Symmetry: C2
Subunit: 125 residues, 2 copies
């Protein structure tokens, strides 16, 4: 296609990260509003995810289990949110300084760009 569409998210401010799962559900780090929002394919209502203690999200990824991974700018950490239980787990990375991008491979290994430390770190689940 040569013509984009705009997704019907609302009230975004400086969004900075996006991920999409197998059902076509789109996840966005709404940076300026310190929240993570998702929109199912073909929906008008967006859903704010129950991340807690977030201090400005920088990036997002989603795995095959529907687990959502988010880099937290102000807390220098990476968190994941389990589907269903909505349990939030802080990944035991250490020495991060402004994690930004996050990615997850098929084996569940988590990769993070450590922006303040000029390095890339990975951590198996």
């Amino acid at each position: 296609s040569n013509t984009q569409t705009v997704l019907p998210f609302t009230g975004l401010n400086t969004p900075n990260g996006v991920a999409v799962d197998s059902a076509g559900t789109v996840y966005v780090t709404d940076h300026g509003n310190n929240r993570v929002v998702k929109l199912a394919a073909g929906s008008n209502t967006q859903t704010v995810l129950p991340f807690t203690g977030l201090n400005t999200p920088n990036g997002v990824a989603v795995d095959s289990a529907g687990t959502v991974y988010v880099t937290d700018h102000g807390n220098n950490r990476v968190v994941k949110l389990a589907a269903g239980s909505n349990t939030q787990t802080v990944l035991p990375f250490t020495g991060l300084n402004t994690p930004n991008g996050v990615a997850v491979d098929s084996a569940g290994t988590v990769y993070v760009t450590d922006h303040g430390n000029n390095r890339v770190v990975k951590l198996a689940a």
Copy 2:
């Protein structure tokens, strides 16, 4: 795991996006050096992808075919490179303003957080 591994990228500056493909190849937007670097799984040396004219790139994604998608933030555009190709393609997005995140679904649809415009746009293959 309580073991994190620093990947053998070198000379990074303010890196800010990471992606990993099905073969375990890792791609990073080395934002401060206007380049995208990659490292094969178990590889000794990073390789710079032959993108042209990148300026403060930020987001990166990779699809199941190994095609690499980069938000070329400083140029308000999204570019992609097929594996082995030496000629990037500028995707026909419209009116982007300081874009950041990019994602790609199984159908090849490309999603971009158009940060400066407080919106998320989508472009089918």
